[PDB]
Amino acid sequence: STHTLLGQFFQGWGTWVASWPLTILVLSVIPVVALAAGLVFTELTTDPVELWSAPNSQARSEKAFHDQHFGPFFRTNQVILTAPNRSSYRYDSLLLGPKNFSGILDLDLLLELLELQERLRHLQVWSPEAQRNISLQDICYAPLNPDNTSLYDCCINSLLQYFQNNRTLLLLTANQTLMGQTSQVDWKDHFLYCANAPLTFKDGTALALSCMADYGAPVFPFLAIGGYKGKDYSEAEALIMTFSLNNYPAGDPRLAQAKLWEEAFLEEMRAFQRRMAGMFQVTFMAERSLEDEINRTTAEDLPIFATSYIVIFLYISLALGSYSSWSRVMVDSKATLGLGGVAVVLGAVMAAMGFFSYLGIRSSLVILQVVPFLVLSVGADNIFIFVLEYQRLPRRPGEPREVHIGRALGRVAPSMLLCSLSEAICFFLGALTPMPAVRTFALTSGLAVILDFLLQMSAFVALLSLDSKRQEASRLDVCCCVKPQELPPPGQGEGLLLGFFQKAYAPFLLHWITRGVVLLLFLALFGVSLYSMCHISVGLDQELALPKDSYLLDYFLFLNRYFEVGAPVYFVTTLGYNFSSEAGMNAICSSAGCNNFSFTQKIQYATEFPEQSYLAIPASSWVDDFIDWLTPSSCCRLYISGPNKDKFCPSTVNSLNCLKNCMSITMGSVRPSVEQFHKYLPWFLNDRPNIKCPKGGLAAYSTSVNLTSDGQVLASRFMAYHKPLKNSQDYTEALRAARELAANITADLRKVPGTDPAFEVFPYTITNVFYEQYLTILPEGLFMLSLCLVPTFAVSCLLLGLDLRSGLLNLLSIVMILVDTVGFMALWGISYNAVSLINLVSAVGMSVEFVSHITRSFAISTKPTWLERAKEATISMGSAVFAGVAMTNLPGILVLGLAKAQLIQIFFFRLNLLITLLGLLHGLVFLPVILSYVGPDVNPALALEQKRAEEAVAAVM
Ligand SMILES: *[C@@H]1O[C@H](CO)[C@@H](O[C@@H]2O[C@H](CO)[C@@H](O)[C@H](O[C@@H]3O[C@H](CO)[C@@H](O)[C@H](O)[C@H]3NC(C)=O)[C@H]2NC(C)=O)[C@H](O)[C@H]1NC(C)=O
Ligand SMILES: *[C@@H]1O[C@H](CO)[C@@H](O[C@@H]2O[C@H](CO)[C@@H](O[C@@H]3O[C@H](CO)[C@@H](O)[C@H](O)[C@H]3NC(C)=O)[C@H](O)[C@H]2NC(C)=O)[C@H](O)[C@H]1NC(C)=O
Ligand SMILES: CCCCCCCCCCCCO[C@@H]1O[C@H](CO)[C@@H](O[C@H]2O[C@H](CO)[C@@H](O)[C@H](O)[C@H]2O)[C@H](O)[C@H]1O
Ligand SMILES: *[C@@H]1O[C@H](CO)[C@@H](O[C@@H]2O[C@H](CO)[C@@H](O)[C@H](O)[C@H]2NC(C)=O)[C@H](O)[C@H]1NC(C)=O
Ligand SMILES: CC(C)CCC[C@@H](C)[C@H]1CC[C@H]2[C@@H]3CC=C4C[C@@H](O)CC[C@]4(C)[C@H]3CC[C@]12C
Ligand SMILES: CC(C)CCC[C@@H](C)[C@H]1CC[C@H]2[C@@H]3CC=C4C[C@@H](O)CC[C@]4(C)[C@H]3CC[C@]12C
Ligand SMILES: CC(C)CCC[C@@H](C)[C@H]1CC[C@H]2[C@@H]3CC=C4C[C@@H](O)CC[C@]4(C)[C@H]3CC[C@]12C
Ligand SMILES: CC(C)CCC[C@@H](C)[C@H]1CC[C@H]2[C@@H]3CC=C4C[C@@H](O)CC[C@]4(C)[C@H]3CC[C@]12C
Ligand SMILES: CC(C)CCC[C@@H](C)[C@H]1CC[C@H]2[C@@H]3CC=C4C[C@@H](O)CC[C@]4(C)[C@H]3CC[C@]12C
Ligand SMILES: CC(C)CCC[C@@H](C)[C@H]1CC[C@H]2[C@@H]3CC=C4C[C@@H](O)CC[C@]4(C)[C@H]3CC[C@]12C
Ligand SMILES: *[C@@H]1O[C@H](CO)[C@@H](O)[C@H](O)[C@H]1NC(C)=O
Ligand SMILES: *[C@@H]1O[C@H](CO)[C@@H](O)[C@H](O)[C@H]1NC(C)=O
Ligand SMILES: *[C@@H]1O[C@H](CO)[C@@H](O)[C@H](O)[C@H]1NC(C)=O
Ligand SMILES: *[C@@H]1O[C@H](CO)[C@@H](O)[C@H](O)[C@H]1NC(C)=O
Ligand SMILES: *[C@@H]1O[C@H](CO)[C@@H](O)[C@H](O)[C@H]1NC(C)=O
Ligand SMILES: *[C@@H]1O[C@H](CO)[C@@H](O)[C@H](O)[C@H]1NC(C)=O
Ligand SMILES: *[C@@H]1O[C@H](CO)[C@@H](O)[C@H](O)[C@H]1NC(C)=O
């Protein structure tokens, strides 16, 4: 047997370590200090939200292709106003009749918003390293003037961009006589005209105001107002103000300038929120806000979390003392054992984190917030079980205490090796997740558990050999430097936990009426959890990642309640498509003699059913606008002759020298040639729209087409908009629907004669990297749990020498614990994600402590009947399991309920509490009752004695 060999080795090792305690203490404490000294050398914490993306996923490669060919997506800063206390009012329009206007659409509130926007556009920030003051124009996203950017070329979207941010145009007034009705046209008529026709250069009213933004692009009504249903724009309940900035890679120095300006913007918006208390109800969001809202509560929650170490120091040496009398309460306190155990757990956690800081592995908030208080839950169990088995084992006559300590260690050492080995294997198998923040946490927890077992095989055995040598002396517990007293002798009264209660609790549990009741209650609980696991929700809401006292939660409430569209989505066409042949242009069209089921018509028909697809606004095509930009009327022109014979006549040139159209006439469905396409495409892409040529140019498609030196098209993107997505299920369904529509597009686009294979069209959204995991998280989680359940059962049958019946009977208990945990997690509204998956994977290994000790104690009992063996196994090991395994993880788990971040308080406190209570209930109430009915038969258990006697005679030389 390979169990008695491990027991004999641990007996000899325990005798040697007890013989050389000071040497083993110094040679085990110096390497731990050497490993833990590197918490400064390369100790860095990864703060952004790129810890929540798999770097090799398909979405990450699509983002890499998009950022390579078009530049990164811009940073967004948003404000939502929604003045709630004002009443709506009736307005008699001249071109539309009677209408209801909201209370927020008033001139005074618009003037206050114009003041806030003008003050926020002129904000300047000092970059700290002796540089210049950073203005908005250095960092703003200018869509149609990126090189020589000005302060009025920045993309700022709001309602006031309909009036070009001009306070005089907002107060403009003129009366119009329409059907003999002189009526006072004002700003409301112009806003009603621009809400329906955003690309307009002359208003159709008495006041002939323009409608374009001051930087030159049209502003759509869903980017400027919210809270309306349909096309009743005047009843909008919210105003939206957006500042868009350029995005750069993480090493770039301009990202620091953008983040400094975003911090100044956030301080200015907090001042505006305090100033307008009885007027608006402002909520705001900067692009940097989520990262420093996630990484904010760590330092203010670590010292509150550190009181569990003091509580676990208190619980040891009060549950391990000997209260035989008041004359010797101080001498048997065992406080040195609790202090050594807390030092062992702290040293193991610090050594694991220091070793990972040696290799340059970045830390995160989850590691610093739950690793020292999750390792502490499972680290003191083996220490408490070893000390309790040492106390319960009587000493033979004429036996030294070193041999006694080795003999006590040799009985419980393989089971406490099995528990730590199963926990380490479960953590390392759970470290196969794609998420880096979960992978580093799993690796740190597994290394901490391995170092904890290696520390408690040597340093705790040396400390227990040391403090038990002052106990035969009359030295006091922690004040052992002096004061040895008379000390009347102790008695073997069996204690209170082992003696009194378990020999008055075991009669209750193993009654004939308690056993059947426990069986048909646990089976019904298993069936109810099996039914209730199917109502579980897959995903992780972003609002759960924030603290409760966060300003981002009010923003997410207003965004989910008032926005009419979601984030923009780009359908990107990669390398391979021609775009220059007529057959390639007909497969992209939407009008004028093109194909019946094209790209854009497919997207538009997808937008007609916004519950099946998740698109609300149809895609804008550069191909269609290029086709009807080339339609000849005052739009593309060529010079007749001169110094420039045929160069280009833009629309801002008045002369008789520009009379020839770029294209010709008399052909229906005007398609340019290959030469005309390659010659005329950059002029369309650089053309600025105006009153006599509003048709298109660099406002929308200057950055949506990548060209080469020859003038061919490498890649393209077509922009549409999602519907409002409120939860992670909406994000995952929108990603799946967009990918299915892109595959349907690609299968049709590949049929065009000339398009090479491997051309594809894919959807790109800024949030795609965070929600691609949930398409395939369920079978990967089932595969990880099935892979974790194998080696625990494999190593529980060679280490402990268990029979197949004993090996199956606790595998059943672990499966019931997992099923009941998933059922209660469905009941409590705990979603299924990577964090809860790693918690369940750790719970597979933590639950072997509840069952393996009791099963091994039942298997090695030479009692006559089955009920007597179950009673002896309960009284022997269920008391130790309750006092150690069930009680050490209560403080570390219960201190995480004061977490102040919702992720720690939901996925680590509630789930670990459910796993602990279900494991205790399945270990101490179900396992003895199921063992009393069906269990292993009696086995020869004298092999342990006849192999222990050889080591006990080998311990003297
Ligand atoms: C239009 O599309 C072209 C081709 O993708 C793109 O040029 C590419 O720009 C990206 C980003 O700047 C570069 O990654 C890429 O090649 C870069 O150039 C160096 C010097 O030769 C290479 O050694 C590197 O592979 C790489 N640099 C880095 C940081 O990886 C570059 N490729 C070429 C051939 O130009 C244009 O930028 C796109 N145009 C627009 C307007 O974005
Ligand atoms: C995208 O589609 C375009 C339209 O089919 C392609 O343009 C075609 O390129 C051909 C060469 O590959 C041209 O044939 C050459 O033209 C001469 C002069 O007309 C002909 O005598 C020859 O057949 C041929 N050259 C030789 C070998 O002498 C096609 O005329 C031309 N099509 C049209 C209608 O202009 C592009 O090549 C294609 N782009 C890519 C990247 O494949
Ligand atoms: C270990 C766990 C720690 C990591 C947890 C990570 C949780 C998930 C974080 C999601 C991050 C992305 O979060 C998302 O960011 C974008 C930034 O454009 C915000 O989007 C913002 O800009 C877009 C423009 O593109 C607007 O349409 C939108 O209204 C605005 O809010 C989204 O409203 C926010 O949901
Ligand atoms: C805001 O609009 C007003 C009116 O259109 C602009 O004032 C006009 O400016 C032009 C050129 O300077 C003058 O010829 C007009 O006589 C002015 N009209 C009035 C009534 O003042 C003003 O320039 C605009 N402001 C901005 C910032 O462009
Ligand atoms: C946190 C880590 C470092 C704790 C584990 C340290 C272990 C692996 C180390 C610490 C002290 C070491 C012992 C120190 C001295 C000796 C005596 C030598 O003649 C044989 C090896 C032996 C017996 C070593 C075995 C390995 C040992 C027990
Ligand atoms: C009982 C437990 C909690 C005690 C151990 C706590 C350890 C793991 C914690 C407490 C304070 C922490 C440090 C607090 C601040 C910083 C600065 C930061 O730029 C790098 C990480 C670093 C250096 C942390 C490393 C981990 C740390 C040392
Ligand atoms: C005449 C006999 C019955 C006197 C009995 C008095 C005994 C039972 C009293 C005296 C001191 C008491 C102990 C003081 C503190 C603790 C800490 C707690 O974590 C376990 C219970 C325990 C250990 C108490 C159990 C009850 C106790 C041991
Ligand atoms: C990020 C990329 C580039 C590097 C590879 C990272 C991942 C895939 C690697 C790094 C270290 C690896 C672990 C190293 C050791 C073990 C212990 C073994 O018993 C099970 C596998 C396990 C747990 C590995 C799983 C995969 C792992 C986590
Ligand atoms: C995974 C973590 C928790 C524990 C790892 C502990 C490992 C290193 C331990 C457990 C069992 C050990 C073995 C037990 C038996 C012997 C026989 C002895 O004559 C030589 C050493 C040797 C062969 C040991 C080497 C170290 C060993 C493999
Ligand atoms: C063996 C263990 C798991 C048994 C104890 C489970 C306890 C802690 C669990 C099981 C079901 C849980 C409840 C399930 C649902 C709700 C409704 C929610 O709006 C508030 C919390 C509340 C009221 C939970 C409180 C905690 C709860 C009572
Ligand atoms: C405006 O709201 C009032 C509420 O009573 C309603 O009577 C009227 O029909 C509404 N007018 C329009 C144009 O919707
Ligand atoms: C910003 O920059 C200039 C040049 O460094 C500096 O002199 C000036 O004082 C700064 N602006 C303000 C308002 O302080
Ligand atoms: C940029 O614009 C300014 C103001 O119009 C002009 O003076 C300057 O010459 C321009 N710079 C370049 C690079 O042409
Ligand atoms: C039309 O215009 C003026 C100024 O807006 C207005 O005050 C007046 O009532 C109107 N004039 C006439 C014809 O009554
Ligand atoms: C609206 O008015 C009520 C009563 O005056 C007040 O309690 C509430 O806070 C106000 N809300 C806002 C945002 O003005
Ligand atoms: C569909 O295709 C045919 C032939 O190309 C065309 O005549 C028709 O107008 C298209 N749509 C329909 C059926 O109206
Ligand atoms: C594309 O695939 C099939 C076949 O054309 C079609 O039924 C489906 O509706 C399309 N995809 C989506 C999501 O519309």
DSSP 49-84: GGGSS-TTSHHHHHHHHHHHHH-PPPEEEEEE----
Question: Residues 750, 786: one domain?
Answer: no
**Residues recorded for the chain:** 957
- Ligand 4 atom closest to Cα of 167? 1
Distance (Å, rounded) from C-alpha 737 to C-alpha 744? 11
Q: For residue 946, is it within any domain? A: no
Strand partners, 351: none
CA of 759 to the centre of ligand 17 (A): 19
- Ligand 17 atom closest to Cα of 613? 13
Residue 535 near residue 693, CB atoms below 8 Å: no
Find all residues with CB under 8 Å of 888, minimum gap 6, and list them: 312, 315, 376, 377, 378, 380, 381, 384
Question: Residues 760, 902: one domain?
Answer: no
Distance (Å, rounded) from C-alpha 365 to C-alpha 360? 16
Q: Which of 178, 184, 185 to mutate to test the pocket of ligand 14 (most atoms within 8 A of CB)?
A: 184
Q: Is 770 in the pocket of ligand 3 (CB under 6 A)?
A: yes
Pull the structure tokens for residue 224: 């400027």
CA of 175 to the centre of ligand 14 (A): 6
Secondary structure of the chain: what % helix, strand, coil (to 5)?
55, 10, 40
Pull the structure tokens for residue 597: 């089921």
Side chain identity at 460, as an amino acid letter? F
Question: Residues 308, 274: one domain?
Answer: no
Question: Residues 692, 832: one domain?
Answer: no
Distance (Å, rounded) from C-alpha 344 to C-alpha 30? 13
Strand partners, 283: 80
Task: Identify the three-state secondary structure at position 173.
Answer: coil
CA of 367 to the centre of ligand 6 (A): 10
Instruction: Report residue 861 CA to chain centroid gap.
Output: 49
Q: Is 318 in the pocket of ligand 7 (CB under 6 A)?
A: yes
- Ligand 12 atom closest to Cα of 126? 1
Residue 657 near residue 641, CB atoms below 8 Å: yes
Question: Residues 303, 371: one domain?
Answer: yes
Q: Is 28 in the pocket of ligand 5 (CB under 6 A)?
A: yes
Side chain identity at 672, as an amino acid letter? P
Q: Which ligand is nearest to the CA of 457?
A: 5
Q: For residue 943, is it within any domain? A: no
Q: Is 424 in the pocket of ligand 9 (CB under 6 A)?
A: yes
Question: Residues 845, 905: one domain?
Answer: yes
Distance (Å, rounded) from C-alpha 833 to C-alpha 823? 15
CA of 246 to the centre of ligand 12 (A): 23
- In the DSSP assignment, the letter for residue 832 is B
Distance (Å, rounded) from C-alpha 891 to C-alpha 305? 10
Distance (Å, rounded) from C-alpha 490 to C-alpha 333? 13
CA of 265 to the centre of ligand 12 (A): 18
Question: Residues 786, 917: one domain?
Answer: yes
Q: For residue 493, is it within any domain? A: no
CA of 124 to the centre of ligand 12 (A): 9
Q: Which ligand is nearest to the CA of 532?
A: 10
Instruction: Report residue 955 CA to chain centroid gap.
Output: 55
- Ligand 4 atom closest to Cα of 169? 2
Q: For residue 485, is it within any domain? A: no
Residue nearest to ligand 11 atom 2, measured at CA: 100
- In the DSSP assignment, the letter for residue 395 is P
CATH, residue 399: 1.20.1640.10
Last residue of a domain, one of 240, 259, 293: 293
Instruction: Select from 19, 29, 34, 6 the least CA-distant residue to 462.
Output: 19
Within 10 angstroms of residue 464's Cβ, the number of other Cβ atoms is 27
In 751-897, at which residue ranges do the beta strands (DSSP E only) sit?
Answer: 761-764
Which parts of 178-250 fold into alpha helices (H)? 187-196
Question: Residues 147, 243: one domain?
Answer: yes
* Cα separations in angstroms, 355 against 372, 556, 891: 15, 40, 27
Question: Residues 444, 524: one domain?
Answer: no
Residue 731 near residue 725, CB atoms below 8 Å: yes
Last residue of a domain, one of 734, 765, 796: 765
Q: Which ligand is nearest to the CA of 741?
A: 17
Question: Residues 235, 313: one domain?
Answer: no
Task: Tell me the pairing of strands 75-80 and 283-285.
Answer: antiparallel
Strand partners, 242: 78, 157
CA of 501 to the centre of ligand 7 (A): 13
Specify the DSSP element, H or E, that contains 716: strand 713-722
Which parts of 129-278 fold into alpha helices (H)? 136-139, 167-170, 187-196, 254-275
- Ligand 17 atom closest to Cα of 744? 1
Q: For residue 50, is it within any domain? A: no
Within 10 angstroms of residue 813's Cβ, the number of other Cβ atoms is 24
Q: Which ligand is nearest to the CA of 577?
A: 2
Q: Which ligand is nearest to the CA of 669?
A: 16
- Ligand 6 atom closest to Cα of 350? 8
Q: Is 674 in the pocket of ligand 2 (CB under 6 A)?
A: yes
Q: For residue 773, is it within any domain? A: no
Residue-number span of the structural domain to which 594 is assigned:
568-765
Residue 897 near residue 305, CB atoms below 8 Å: no
Last residue of a domain, one of 765, 788, 810: 765
Distance (Å, rounded) from C-alpha 394 to C-alpha 412? 15
* Cα separations in angstroms, 3 against 77, 737, 797: 64, 56, 9
Q: Which ligand is nearest to the CA of 608?
A: 17
Question: Residues 130, 262: one domain?
Answer: yes
- Number of structural domains (the chain) is 4
CA of 368 to the centre of ligand 6 (A): 7
Side chain identity at 828, as an amino acid letter? W
Q: Is 453 in the pocket of ligand 9 (CB under 6 A)?
A: yes
Q: For residue 271, is it within any domain? A: yes
Pull the structure tokens for residue 208: 């002939």
Residue 880 near residue 853, CB atoms below 8 Å: yes
In 213-316, at which residue ranges do the beta strands (DSSP E only) sit?
Answer: 225-226, 238-245, 283-285
Question: Residues 288, 299: one domain?
Answer: no
Residue 65 near residue 72, CB atoms below 8 Å: no
Q: For residue 451, is it within any domain? A: yes
CA of 596 to the centre of ligand 16 (A): 6
Distance (Å, rounded) from C-alpha 163 to C-alpha 705? 30
- In the DSSP assignment, the letter for residue 745 is H
